[PDB]
């Protein structure tokens, strides 16, 4: 039985290495990573890989790994796939912990925009969880944390993290992580997967996929929002992505909205993430 080496980047930035039989389905590798992580609430997570166009793709757990990575390296990341709208309802603290690690990367990367005060508050909960109670011995007037808190760090932001960290004395790691999540979950881009597209007129938009539905960001004025229950059919054809919006009360016909994606693979990827979100968030 021939086995392929897999390398998985974990949410703490470390690398997990294991072997699977070369015809293994994605679920096999995912089960190994999740056991390594002592993770039981596995439904929120998945593995990504980079395709031959260098795009992030979800590893389909039901399909052979080799028919997805194809010509590419067996290199993956472990990621949150479905961001829980109410992290307090997850059954395990360790689930909330991995969700915090993902969100920290969402913030530092700039995928999850955040005000100065919310960056400092989230940072303060991370420090409380990671180091425990504020200690002045590890912080003079010139302190800069090893923790990455933001896409761009300033001395002012470092100072505000410490000031709020001082307020959290006696907070336990699970408590600080829950506070982190209670704040993060409110951010307007929380759990929004953004896809570049053009509308039916050729105007550049972003489509966001999340728990509450599909978001169509045209400009700062008028953001179109469509709740999953308002969506009956999601389809792609060539470079095109279509959603079938259900008839409003007393309307005779479903309405169709068309988008142009960069290429056929980008349209299929958007279709699959929409179908998966619709199914997942239909059951929650
Ligand atoms: C507040 C918003 N930001 C974006 C955006 O283009 N983003 C790219 C990085 C994450 C956000 C929208 C589409 S709405």
From Swiss-Prot:
Domain of life: Eukaryota
N-terminal signal peptide: none
UniProt-annotated location(s): Cytoplasm, Cytoskeleton; Cell junction; Cell membrane; Cytoplasm
FERM domain segment(s): 4-284
Tissue: Expressed at high levels in brain, with lower levels in kidney, intestine, and testis. Detected in lung.
Biological function: Tumor suppressor that inhibits cell proliferation and promotes apoptosis. Modulates the activity of protein arginine N-methyltransferases, including PRMT3 and PRMT5.
Quaternary structure, from the entry: Interacts (via FERM domain) with CADM1. Interacts (via FERM domain) with PRMT3; the interaction is direct and inhibits the protein-arginine N-methyltransferase activity of PRMT3. Interacts with PRMT5. Interacts with PRMT6.
Protein name: Band 4.1-like protein 3
Taxonomic source organism: Homo sapiens (Human)
């Amino acid at each position: 039985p021939k086995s392929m080496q897999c390398k998985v980047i974990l949410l703490d930035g470390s690398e997990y290495t294991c072997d699977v039989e070369k015809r293994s389905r994605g679920q096999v590798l995912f089960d190994k990573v999740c056991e390594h992580l002592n993770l039981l609430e596995k439904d929120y997570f998945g593995l990504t890989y980079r395709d031959a166009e260098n795009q992030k793709n979800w590893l389909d757990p039901a399909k052979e790994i080799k028919k997805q990575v194809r010509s590419g390296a067996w290199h993956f990341s472990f990621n949150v796939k479905f961001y829980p709208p109410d992290p307090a309802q997850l059954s395990e603290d360790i689930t909330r912990y991995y969700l915090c690690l993902q969100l920290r990367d969402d913030i530092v990367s700039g995928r999850l925009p955040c005000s100065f005060v919310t960056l400092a508050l989230l940072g303060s909960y991370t420090v409380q969880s990671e180091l425990g109670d504020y200690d002045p011995d590890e912080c003079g007037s010139d302190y800069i944390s090893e923790f990455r808190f933001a896409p761009n760090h300033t001395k002012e932001l470092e100072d505000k993290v410490i000031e709020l960290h001082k307020s959290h004395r006696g907070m336990t790691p699970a408590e600080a992580e829950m506070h982190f999540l209670e704040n993060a979950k409110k951010l307007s881009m929380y759990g929004v997967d953004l896809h570049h597209a053009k509308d039916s007129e050729g105007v550049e938009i972003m489509l966001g996929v999340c728990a509450s539905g599909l978001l169509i960001y045209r400009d700062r004025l008028r953001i179109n929002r469509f709740a999953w229950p308002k969506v009956l059919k999601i389809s792609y054809k060539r470079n095109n992505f279509y959603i079938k919006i259900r008839p409003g009360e007393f309307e005779q016909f479903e309405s169709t909205i068309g988008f142009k994606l960069p290429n056929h693979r980008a349209a299929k990827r958007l279709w699959k993430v929409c179908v998966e979100h619709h199914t997942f968030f239909r059951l929650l």
